[PDB]
Design a protein around this ligand. Sequence first.
Ligand SMILES: OC[C@H](Cc1ccc(I)cc1)Nc1ncnc2[nH]ccc12
Ligand SMILES: [Cl-]
Length: 167
Amino acid sequence: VNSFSGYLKLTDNVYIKNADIVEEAKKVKPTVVVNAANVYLKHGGGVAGALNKATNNAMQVESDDYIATNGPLKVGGSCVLSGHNLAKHCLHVVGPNVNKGEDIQLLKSAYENFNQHEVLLAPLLSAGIFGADPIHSLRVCVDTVRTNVYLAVFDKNLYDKLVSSFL
Ligand SMILES: OC[C@H](Cc1ccc(I)cc1)Nc1ncnc2[nH]ccc12
Ligand SMILES: [Cl-]
């Protein structure tokens, strides 16, 4: 039993809700919140910009030190950093950004990072400003993640289509 509330159950391990991940993380304070990151950990817009703003830029400060030490992530890769005031940990995961011409096949690799954590609050990878088809992202999530994932979906209208078309 966990403290997530109001989610629709899609499969044995995937749950979905129309919600603002910033507000959800502040309420639940989950062990792991997933950020829709880029390889440079520049949290400018989308989920990343919103999560970073909610940390008063502490996420960006920590991320800049991470990159200065380690260099950029790989597309499809991840790193674990602090969750600041939002969660215990933040798993920064880089899905492919179609608006940069990146290979959508890397979306499965991106979701594989979730399997290293028993329970996660997460957005749909490569959706929103990353330019992939969200119906595809949900399908890859369900077919790749085996741990317990609570998906927040920003747009109330978007959410209804994913549910109604969910196979
Ligand atoms: O897949 C991630 C999703 C992308 C998306 C945005 C808008 C439309 I229209 C269609 C897709 N963005 C978010 N999901 C959950 N919480 C969020 N907080 C801030 C942004 C955000
Ligand atoms: Cl977005």
